[PDB]
Coordinates of C-alpha atoms and ligand atoms in Angstrom, one line a residue:
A1 CA 5.6 -0.3 -14.9
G2 CA 6.3 -2.7 -12.1
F3 CA 3.2 -2.6 -10.0
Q4 CA 2.7 1.1 -10.3
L5 CA -0.8 2.4 -11.4
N6 CA -1.7 5.6 -13.1
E7 CA -5.5 5.3 -13.0
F8 CA -6.5 8.2 -10.8
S9 CA -9.5 9.3 -13.0
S10 CA -11.6 8.4 -16.0
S11 CA -10.7 11.6 -17.8
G12 CA -7.0 11.3 -18.3
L13 CA -7.5 7.6 -18.7
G14 CA -8.9 8.9 -22.0
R15 CA -5.9 11.2 -22.2
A16 CA -3.6 8.2 -21.6
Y17 CA -2.5 10.3 -18.6
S18 CA -0.6 12.8 -20.7
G19 CA 0.1 16.2 -19.2
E20 CA -1.6 15.3 -15.9
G21 CA -0.5 17.9 -13.4
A22 CA -0.8 20.6 -16.0
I23 CA -4.5 20.1 -16.7
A24 CA -7.3 20.9 -14.4
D25 CA -10.6 20.4 -16.2
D26 CA -11.9 18.4 -13.3
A27 CA -11.0 17.7 -9.6
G28 CA -9.1 14.5 -10.4
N29 CA -5.8 16.3 -11.3
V30 CA -5.1 17.7 -7.8
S31 CA -4.2 14.2 -6.7
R32 CA -1.3 14.3 -9.2
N33 CA -0.3 17.9 -8.6
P34 CA -1.4 19.8 -5.5
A35 CA -0.5 23.1 -7.1
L36 CA -3.4 22.8 -9.6
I37 CA -5.7 23.6 -6.6
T38 CA -5.2 27.3 -7.5
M39 CA -7.1 26.5 -10.6
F40 CA -10.4 26.0 -8.9
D41 CA -12.9 28.8 -8.0
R42 CA -15.2 26.6 -5.9
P43 CA -15.7 23.3 -4.2
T44 CA -15.3 20.6 -6.8
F45 CA -16.0 16.9 -6.5
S46 CA -15.1 13.9 -8.7
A47 CA -15.6 10.2 -8.2
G48 CA -15.5 7.0 -10.2
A49 CA -13.5 4.0 -10.9
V50 CA -11.4 2.1 -13.6
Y51 CA -11.8 -1.5 -14.5
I52 CA -8.5 -3.0 -15.6
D53 CA -8.9 -6.2 -17.5
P54 CA -5.4 -7.6 -18.1
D55 CA -4.7 -10.5 -20.5
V56 CA -1.3 -11.8 -19.4
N57 CA -0.2 -15.3 -20.3
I58 CA 2.7 -17.6 -19.5
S59 CA 4.1 -20.3 -21.8
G60 CA 6.9 -22.9 -21.4
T61 CA 8.0 -26.4 -20.6
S62 CA 9.5 -27.6 -17.4
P63 CA 12.4 -30.0 -17.0
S64 CA 9.8 -32.4 -15.7
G65 CA 8.1 -32.5 -19.1
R66 CA 5.1 -30.6 -17.8
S67 CA 3.7 -27.5 -19.5
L68 CA 4.4 -24.1 -17.9
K69 CA 1.4 -22.8 -19.8
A70 CA -0.7 -20.5 -17.6
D71 CA -3.4 -18.4 -19.3
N72 CA -4.8 -15.3 -17.8
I73 CA -2.8 -15.0 -14.6
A74 CA -3.6 -11.3 -14.1
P75 CA -7.1 -10.9 -12.5
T76 CA -9.2 -7.9 -13.5
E77 CA -8.9 -5.0 -11.0
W78 CA -11.3 -2.3 -9.8
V79 CA -9.6 0.9 -9.0
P80 CA -11.9 3.5 -7.4
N81 CA -11.0 7.2 -7.2
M82 CA -12.5 10.1 -5.4
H83 CA -11.5 13.8 -5.2
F84 CA -12.6 17.0 -3.6
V85 CA -11.0 20.4 -4.1
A86 CA -12.0 23.6 -2.3
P87 CA -10.8 27.3 -2.3
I88 CA -9.8 28.8 1.0
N89 CA -9.6 32.2 -0.8
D90 CA -8.1 33.9 -3.8
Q91 CA -4.7 32.9 -2.3
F92 CA -5.0 29.4 -0.9
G93 CA -6.9 26.2 -1.5
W94 CA -6.9 22.6 -0.3
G95 CA -7.9 19.2 -1.5
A96 CA -8.3 15.6 -0.5
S97 CA -8.5 12.4 -2.5
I98 CA -8.5 8.6 -2.4
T99 CA -6.6 6.8 -5.2
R100 CA -4.4 3.8 -6.0
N101 CA -0.8 4.5 -7.0
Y102 CA 0.3 0.9 -6.5
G103 CA -1.2 -2.5 -7.1
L104 CA -0.6 -6.0 -8.3
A105 CA -2.6 -9.2 -8.7
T106 CA -1.1 -12.4 -10.2
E107 CA -2.7 -15.8 -9.7
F108 CA -1.7 -19.4 -10.8
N109 CA -3.7 -22.6 -10.1
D110 CA -2.2 -24.1 -7.0
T111 CA -1.4 -27.2 -9.0
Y112 CA 0.7 -25.2 -11.4
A113 CA 4.0 -27.0 -12.3
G114 CA 6.0 -23.9 -11.6
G115 CA 4.1 -23.2 -8.4
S116 CA 7.2 -22.5 -6.4
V117 CA 7.5 -19.2 -8.2
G118 CA 3.9 -18.9 -9.3
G119 CA 1.1 -19.3 -6.8
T120 CA -0.5 -16.1 -5.6
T121 CA 0.6 -12.5 -5.4
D122 CA -1.7 -9.7 -4.2
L123 CA -0.9 -6.1 -3.3
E124 CA -3.6 -3.6 -2.5
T125 CA -2.8 0.0 -1.9
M126 CA -4.9 3.0 -1.1
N127 CA -3.6 6.6 -1.0
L128 CA -5.4 9.1 1.3
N129 CA -4.1 12.5 0.3
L130 CA -4.6 15.9 2.0
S131 CA -3.1 18.9 0.1
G132 CA -2.7 22.7 0.3
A133 CA -1.7 25.2 -2.4
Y134 CA -0.6 28.8 -2.6
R135 CA -0.8 31.1 -5.6
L136 CA 2.0 33.6 -5.6
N137 CA 0.8 35.6 -8.6
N138 CA -0.8 35.1 -12.0
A139 CA 2.0 32.7 -13.0
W140 CA 3.3 30.7 -10.0
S141 CA 1.5 28.4 -7.7
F142 CA 2.8 25.9 -5.1
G143 CA 1.3 22.7 -3.7
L144 CA 2.2 20.4 -0.9
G145 CA 0.5 17.2 0.1
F146 CA 0.5 14.6 2.9
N147 CA -0.3 11.0 2.2
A148 CA -1.4 8.1 4.3
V149 CA -1.2 4.8 2.4
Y150 CA -3.0 1.7 3.6
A151 CA -1.7 -1.6 2.1
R152 CA -3.0 -5.1 2.2
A153 CA -0.7 -7.8 0.8
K154 CA -0.7 -11.6 0.5
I155 CA 1.9 -14.0 -0.9
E156 CA 1.5 -17.7 -1.4
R157 CA 3.8 -20.1 -3.3
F158 CA 3.4 -23.9 -3.9
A159 CA 5.5 -27.0 -4.5
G160 CA 4.7 -27.3 -8.2
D161 CA 6.8 -30.1 -9.7
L162 CA 9.9 -29.7 -7.5
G163 CA 9.1 -33.0 -5.6
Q164 CA 9.0 -34.8 -8.9
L165 CA 12.2 -33.2 -10.1
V166 CA 14.0 -34.0 -6.8
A167 CA 12.8 -37.6 -6.9
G168 CA 14.0 -38.0 -10.4
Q169 CA 17.5 -36.6 -9.6
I170 CA 17.9 -38.8 -6.5
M171 CA 16.8 -41.8 -8.5
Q172 CA 19.3 -41.1 -11.4
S173 CA 22.0 -40.8 -8.7
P174 CA 24.0 -43.5 -6.9
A175 CA 21.9 -42.6 -3.9
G176 CA 19.0 -44.0 -5.9
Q177 CA 20.2 -47.5 -5.0
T178 CA 20.4 -46.7 -1.2
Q179 CA 17.9 -47.1 1.6
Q180 CA 18.4 -43.4 2.6
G181 CA 18.0 -42.3 -1.0
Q182 CA 14.8 -44.2 -1.5
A183 CA 13.3 -42.8 1.7
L184 CA 14.3 -39.4 0.4
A185 CA 12.7 -40.0 -3.0
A186 CA 9.5 -41.2 -1.4
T187 CA 9.3 -38.0 0.6
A188 CA 10.0 -35.8 -2.4
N189 CA 7.4 -37.6 -4.5
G190 CA 5.1 -37.2 -1.6
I191 CA 5.2 -33.4 -1.7
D192 CA 2.1 -32.6 -3.7
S193 CA 2.1 -29.8 -6.2
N194 CA -0.5 -27.8 -4.2
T195 CA 1.6 -28.2 -1.1
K196 CA 1.8 -24.6 0.3
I197 CA 5.5 -23.7 0.2
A198 CA 5.1 -20.2 1.6
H199 CA 2.5 -17.9 3.0
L200 CA 2.8 -14.2 3.7
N201 CA 0.1 -11.7 4.6
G202 CA -0.3 -8.4 6.3
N203 CA -1.8 -4.9 6.3
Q204 CA 0.0 -1.8 7.3
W205 CA 0.0 2.0 6.9
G206 CA 2.8 4.0 5.4
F207 CA 3.2 7.7 5.0
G208 CA 4.6 10.1 2.5
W209 CA 4.4 13.6 1.1
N210 CA 4.2 15.2 -2.3
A211 CA 4.6 18.6 -3.9
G212 CA 4.1 20.5 -7.1
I213 CA 4.9 23.7 -8.9
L214 CA 2.6 25.2 -11.5
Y215 CA 3.7 27.9 -13.9
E216 CA 1.2 29.4 -16.4
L217 CA 2.1 31.8 -19.2
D218 CA -1.6 32.6 -19.6
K219 CA -5.0 31.0 -19.0
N220 CA -4.4 28.5 -21.8
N221 CA -0.8 27.4 -21.4
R222 CA 0.9 25.9 -18.4
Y223 CA 3.7 23.7 -17.3
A224 CA 4.2 21.7 -14.1
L225 CA 6.8 19.8 -12.0
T226 CA 5.8 17.3 -9.3
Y227 CA 7.4 15.0 -6.8
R228 CA 5.8 12.1 -5.0
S229 CA 8.0 10.9 -2.2
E230 CA 8.8 7.2 -1.6
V231 CA 6.6 5.5 0.9
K232 CA 7.9 2.7 3.1
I233 CA 5.5 0.2 4.4
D234 CA 6.8 -1.7 7.4
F235 CA 4.7 -4.9 7.4
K236 CA 4.3 -7.0 10.6
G237 CA 2.3 -10.0 9.6
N238 CA 2.0 -13.8 9.3
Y239 CA 4.3 -16.3 7.7
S240 CA 4.1 -20.0 7.3
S241 CA 5.1 -23.0 5.2
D242 CA 3.4 -26.4 5.1
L243 CA 6.7 -28.1 4.5
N244 CA 8.2 -30.2 7.3
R245 CA 10.9 -28.3 9.3
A246 CA 13.3 -31.1 8.6
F247 CA 13.8 -29.3 5.2
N248 CA 15.5 -26.4 6.9
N249 CA 19.1 -25.4 7.2
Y250 CA 20.5 -27.4 4.3
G251 CA 20.9 -24.4 2.1
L252 CA 18.0 -25.5 -0.2
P253 CA 16.5 -22.7 -2.4
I254 CA 13.2 -22.9 -0.5
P255 CA 11.4 -20.6 2.0
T256 CA 11.6 -21.5 5.7
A257 CA 9.5 -24.5 6.5
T258 CA 7.3 -24.2 9.6
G259 CA 5.4 -27.5 9.7
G260 CA 2.3 -25.4 8.9
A261 CA 2.8 -23.3 12.1
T262 CA 2.2 -19.6 11.7
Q263 CA 5.1 -17.4 12.6
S264 CA 5.3 -13.6 13.1
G265 CA 7.0 -11.9 10.2
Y266 CA 8.4 -8.5 9.2
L267 CA 8.8 -7.1 5.7
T268 CA 9.5 -3.6 4.5
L269 CA 8.0 -2.7 1.1
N270 CA 9.4 0.3 -0.7
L271 CA 6.9 2.2 -2.8
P272 CA 9.0 4.2 -5.4
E273 CA 9.2 8.0 -5.4
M274 CA 8.0 9.6 -8.7
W275 CA 8.9 12.8 -10.6
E276 CA 6.9 14.3 -13.5
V277 CA 7.2 17.3 -15.7
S278 CA 3.9 18.4 -17.5
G279 CA 2.6 20.7 -20.2
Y280 CA -0.9 21.8 -21.3
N281 CA -1.5 23.9 -24.4
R282 CA -5.0 25.1 -25.5
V283 CA -4.0 26.2 -29.0
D284 CA -7.7 26.9 -29.9
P285 CA -11.1 27.4 -28.3
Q286 CA -11.8 23.7 -29.2
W287 CA -8.3 22.1 -29.2
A288 CA -5.8 21.5 -26.5
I289 CA -2.6 19.4 -26.5
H290 CA -1.2 17.7 -23.4
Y291 CA 2.0 15.8 -22.7
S292 CA 4.4 14.7 -19.9
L293 CA 7.6 12.8 -19.0
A294 CA 7.5 10.8 -15.7
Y295 CA 10.5 9.2 -13.9
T296 CA 9.8 6.6 -11.2
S297 CA 12.9 5.6 -9.1
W298 CA 12.1 1.9 -9.2
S299 CA 15.7 1.3 -8.1
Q300 CA 14.3 1.8 -4.7
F301 CA 12.6 -1.6 -4.9
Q302 CA 15.5 -4.0 -4.4
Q303 CA 13.9 -7.1 -2.8
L304 CA 11.1 -8.7 -0.9
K305 CA 12.6 -9.9 2.4
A306 CA 10.5 -11.3 5.3
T307 CA 12.0 -11.7 8.7
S308 CA 11.2 -13.5 11.9
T309 CA 11.3 -12.2 15.5
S310 CA 14.8 -13.5 15.8
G311 CA 16.0 -11.7 12.7
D312 CA 16.2 -14.9 10.6
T313 CA 15.3 -14.7 7.0
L314 CA 12.1 -16.7 6.4
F315 CA 11.5 -15.7 2.7
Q316 CA 13.6 -13.6 0.3
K317 CA 13.3 -12.7 -3.3
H318 CA 15.8 -10.4 -5.1
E319 CA 14.1 -8.0 -7.4
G320 CA 16.8 -5.5 -8.4
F321 CA 14.7 -3.0 -10.3
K322 CA 16.0 0.0 -12.2
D323 CA 14.6 3.5 -12.6
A324 CA 12.1 3.9 -15.5
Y325 CA 10.5 6.7 -17.6
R326 CA 7.0 7.1 -18.9
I327 CA 6.1 9.4 -21.9
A328 CA 2.6 10.5 -22.8
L329 CA 1.0 12.8 -25.4
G330 CA -2.6 13.6 -26.1
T331 CA -5.2 16.1 -27.2
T332 CA -8.6 17.2 -26.1
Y333 CA -11.3 18.4 -28.4
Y334 CA -14.1 20.4 -26.8
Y335 CA -16.8 20.1 -29.4
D336 CA -19.5 22.2 -27.6
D337 CA -20.8 23.1 -24.1
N338 CA -21.9 19.5 -23.6
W339 CA -19.3 17.4 -25.4
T340 CA -15.6 17.0 -24.9
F341 CA -13.5 14.4 -26.7
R342 CA -10.0 13.1 -26.0
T343 CA -7.3 10.7 -27.2
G344 CA -3.9 9.7 -26.0
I345 CA -0.7 7.7 -26.7
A346 CA 1.8 6.7 -24.1
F347 CA 4.9 4.6 -23.5
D348 CA 6.2 3.4 -20.1
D349 CA 9.5 1.6 -19.9
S350 CA 9.6 -1.5 -17.7
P351 CA 11.9 -1.2 -14.5
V352 CA 12.7 -4.9 -14.5
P353 CA 16.1 -5.9 -15.9
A354 CA 15.8 -9.0 -18.1
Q355 CA 17.7 -11.2 -15.6
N356 CA 15.4 -10.2 -12.7
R357 CA 12.1 -10.8 -14.5
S358 CA 9.8 -13.1 -12.6
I359 CA 6.5 -14.6 -13.5
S360 CA 4.9 -13.1 -10.3
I361 CA 5.3 -9.6 -11.8
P362 CA 4.9 -10.2 -15.5
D363 CA 6.0 -6.7 -16.4
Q364 CA 7.3 -5.3 -19.8
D365 CA 7.5 -2.1 -21.8
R366 CA 4.0 -0.9 -22.6
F367 CA 2.4 1.2 -25.3
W368 CA -0.9 2.8 -24.5
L369 CA -3.6 3.9 -26.9
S370 CA -6.8 5.6 -25.6
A371 CA -10.0 7.5 -26.2
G372 CA -12.6 9.1 -24.0
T373 CA -15.4 11.6 -24.0
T374 CA -17.1 13.8 -21.4
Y375 CA -20.8 14.9 -21.4
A376 CA -21.6 18.1 -19.7
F377 CA -25.0 18.1 -18.0
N378 CA -25.2 21.7 -16.9
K379 CA -21.9 23.6 -16.3
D380 CA -22.0 22.1 -12.8
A381 CA -22.3 18.3 -13.3
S382 CA -20.7 16.1 -15.9
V383 CA -19.7 12.5 -16.6
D384 CA -16.5 11.0 -17.9
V385 CA -16.0 7.8 -19.8
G386 CA -12.7 6.5 -21.1
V387 CA -11.1 3.5 -22.6
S388 CA -7.5 2.4 -23.1
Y389 CA -5.8 -0.5 -24.8
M390 CA -2.5 -1.6 -23.4
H391 CA -0.1 -3.7 -25.5
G392 CA 3.1 -5.1 -24.1
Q393 CA 6.2 -6.7 -25.6
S394 CA 6.5 -10.5 -25.0
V395 CA 9.6 -11.4 -23.0
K396 CA 11.6 -14.4 -21.9
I397 CA 11.9 -15.3 -18.2
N398 CA 14.5 -17.5 -16.4
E399 CA 13.5 -18.1 -12.8
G400 CA 14.7 -20.9 -10.6
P401 CA 15.1 -24.0 -12.8
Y402 CA 12.4 -22.8 -15.2
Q403 CA 12.4 -20.9 -18.5
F404 CA 9.1 -19.1 -19.3
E405 CA 7.8 -16.7 -21.9
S406 CA 5.1 -14.2 -21.2
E407 CA 2.8 -11.9 -23.2
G408 CA 0.4 -9.4 -21.9
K409 CA -2.2 -6.8 -23.0
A410 CA -5.0 -5.0 -21.4
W411 CA -8.3 -3.2 -21.8
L412 CA -9.3 -0.4 -19.5
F413 CA -12.8 1.1 -19.0
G414 CA -13.7 4.0 -16.6
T415 CA -16.4 6.4 -15.6
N416 CA -16.4 9.3 -13.2
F417 CA -19.1 11.7 -12.2
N418 CA -18.2 15.3 -11.7
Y419 CA -19.9 18.0 -9.7
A420 CA -19.0 21.7 -8.9
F421 CA -21.0 23.6 -6.3
Ligands
LDA501 C1 23.9 -35.2 2.7 C2 22.8 -35.2 3.8 C3 21.7 -36.2 3.4 C4 20.7 -36.1 4.6 C5 19.4 -36.8 4.2 C6 18.7 -37.0 5.6 C7 18.2 -38.4 5.9 C8 17.6 -38.5 7.3
LDA502 C1 4.1 -9.8 6.4 C2 4.6 -10.0 5.0 C3 3.6 -9.5 4.0 C4 4.2 -9.7 2.7 C5 3.3 -9.3 1.5 C6 4.2 -8.4 0.7 C7 3.6 -8.2 -0.7 C8 4.6 -7.2 -1.5 C9 3.9 -7.0 -2.8 C10 4.9 -6.7 -3.9 C11 4.8 -7.8 -5.1 C12 5.2 -9.2 -4.6 N1 6.1 -10.1 -5.4 C13 5.6 -10.4 -6.7 C14 7.3 -9.2 -5.8 O1 6.6 -11.1 -4.8
LDA503 C1 11.2 -37.3 8.6 C2 11.5 -36.0 7.9 C3 10.5 -35.7 6.8 C4 10.9 -34.4 6.1 C5 11.5 -34.6 4.8 C6 12.7 -33.6 4.8 C7 13.9 -34.1 3.9 C8 15.0 -33.1 4.0 C9 16.1 -33.7 3.1 C10 17.2 -32.6 2.7 C11 18.5 -33.4 2.4 C12 19.4 -32.5 1.4

């Protein structure tokens, strides 16, 4: 789902995040729907983390004859999560949490033949949420939240085999027999594959709000609607390219060369708004069913465009994403006072139109299968453990002068410790 993340808690991870927003067995869920606060009778704490181990691979052959094979370009991630919920009174409550709604990590060896569109891509996001909720009656509750998002990002691209390709072309041309052409070819050949073609890094804060509506027929059946506003991060960081400035202003498809000099850069990153409808049904003292449909407006992510203090475009990449949906269904089986078991299935559509696919964001439609279990220590303290398997469809990628093919899957493991005072 682009670079969107749903791992806000270990439980739920075991649910395949189905019906989040309509379930409140532990404090984690307030982060997804502030209205659920009215479901807590006392200060409740939750904290843990999810290890995401992706297995994304790239295959292909370049016009240079070199392999575009790149195994495991998606590094494993560690997504912590922490929550606290507290009643103000039988009418209002509040909560605070630290989670990750967005993130991405793609890494190619700097000598990768397709380095110009490979290299390194890292996006780290942290969401600090503060919420409040109001219960109107036995059925309706309302929640509103404020969010402060800290983001650390870094982008690096390399020459790859472009120098070789350029040299080849010059040499196959009438210019190949000329002094100017030869000097040109020498230079092109001289551009090593690990030559840093572009560098972009920065950290910045963004702000957004969210809200939720909870409606419960009774104490065992509820539905929810939530909205997470878009969050715009206005980066002000550093840009550079180790290429010689003599490369500039010819119209070449290459980021602005700065002779290695660092230049101040601006880039706005749009973090997509999200909508979600949820349902939780406890059809028995030991069985509950949960499901949801989420809609993330990825069309809000149109491009990555870095700009200089003069307003010149130093680096630009069209993304052209489209809105996407996510569907999830799961059930929880409360065996006894100590044990609770859960499973889930989910499907999230990729927001990237085929012609806009890039190897930097190896996304694709995903199917999730998961299982988890929770051990209750004493009606006040518990531990959650969940696992999920992600399987994605292999797709073709045409980027620049290259044709790639990618496949990706993933294993997720998480644990969270819960405590209610
Ligand atoms: C068509 C322009 C070719 C310019 C190459 C520059 C040589 C110095
Ligand atoms: C000061 C500029 C800082 C730029 C770092 C921006 C990172 C944006 C992360 C989104 C994913 C990047 N990608 C793959 C689309 O290029
Ligand atoms: C002495 C300049 C060394 C930098 C090499 C830059 C070559 C730019 C050629 C682009 C012609 C199209």
